[PDB]
Swiss-Prot record:
Protein's cellular compartments: Secreted; Cell surface; Secreted, Extracellular space, Extracellular matrix; Endoplasmic reticulum
Family: Belongs to the thrombospondin family.
Annotated protein name in UniProt: Thrombospondin-1
Cystine residue pairs: 142-203
Chain intervals for the UniProt region annotation (Heparin-binding): 18-66
Function: Adhesive glycoprotein that mediates cell-to-cell and cell-to-matrix interactions. Multifunctional, involved in inflammation, angiogenesis, wound healing, reactive oxygen species (ROS) signaling, nitrous oxide (NO) signaling, apoptosis, senescence, aging, cellular self-renewal, stemness, and cardiovascular and metabolic homeostasis. Negatively modulates dendritic cell activation and cytokine release, as part of an autocrine feedback loop, contributing to the resolution of inflammation and immune homeostasis. Ligand for receptor CD47.
Laminin G-like domain span: 36-203
Organ and tissue specificity: Expressed by platelets (at protein level). Expressed by monocyte-derived immature and mature dendritic cells (at protein level).
Gene name of this polypeptide: THBS1
Summary of subunit composition and partner proteins: Homotrimer; disulfide-linked. Can bind to fibrinogen, fibronectin, laminin, type V collagen and integrins alpha-V/beta-1, alpha-V/beta-3 and alpha-IIb/beta-3. Binds heparin. Interacts (via the C-terminal domain) with CD47. Interacts (via the TSP type I repeats) with CD36; the interaction conveys an antiangiogenic effect. Interacts (via the TSP type I repeats) with HRG; the interaction blocks the antiangiogenic effect of THBS1 with CD36. Interacts with ATF6 (via lumenal domain).
Induction: Expression is induced by PGE2, S.aureus and lipopolysaccharide. Induced in arteries and lung parenchyma following injury or stress. Expression in vasculature, including arteries, increases in normal aging.
Length: 203
């Protein structure tokens, strides 16, 4: 389990946020004000995560969010240290009503949309994103699964060197995709299945 907000240390480090209330009463919720001021995930931490994806050939990402209507907000993104772009990002697109998965491999950027994933209602929603090999499975709360196939296997982006040329940034998008709203419990979980999470929360 990699809890992004916990790792970046945003609860007691940097700005860009206001600790508020979230569905989970036992952990912080962050209303995003300026995504560039939230510290990134330290590199020793990001590479730990990269190794875990490296191993599972994928990951299970969890997140609760309360996004503003009709907006495109970025849950998280791997931005290159040599300031130019992202190598991977997850965007809740309230204009298309999709969850976009973007992977840039060797100067080639690929984007696929998971359809019928409207999360940009101005109310709390929990997602369970399961990515393995080139397959993406999304469960919003307890409603039925939505699918999408990547153009390239997820681990191909998650290379062994990843941490030294890029850093993991939460809520921060690409010039017009910073998350507008509140986020809670953004986490990468390994060795578990989406079915276990679905039951582990009463579906």
């Amino acid at each position: 389990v990699f809890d992004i907000f916990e790792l970046t240390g945003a609860a007691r480090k940097g700005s860009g946020r206001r600790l508020v209330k979230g569905p989970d009463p036992s952990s912080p919720a962050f209303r995003i004000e300026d995504a560039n001021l939230i510290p990134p995930v330290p590199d020793d931490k990001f590479q730990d995560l990269v190794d875990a994806v490296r191993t599972e050939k994928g990951f299970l990402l969890l997140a609760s969010l309360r996004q503003m209507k009709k907006t495109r907000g970025t849950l998280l993104a791997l931005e290159r240290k040599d300031h130019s772009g992202q190598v991977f990002s997850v965007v809740s697109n309230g204009k298309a009503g999709t969850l976009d998965l973007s992977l840039t491999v060797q100067g080639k950027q690929h984007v696929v949309s998971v359809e019928e994933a409207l999360l940009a209602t101005g109310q709390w929603k929990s997602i369970t994103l399961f990515v393995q090999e080139d397959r993406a499975q999304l469960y919003i709360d307890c409603e039925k699964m939505e699918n999408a196939e990547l153009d390239v296997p997820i681990q191909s982006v998650f290379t062994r060197d990843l941490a030294s040329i890029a850093r993991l940034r939460i809520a921060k998008g690409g010039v017009n995709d910073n998350f507008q709203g509140v986020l809670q419990n953004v986490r990468f979980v390994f060795g578990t299945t989406p079915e276990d999470i679905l039951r582990n929360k009463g579906c």
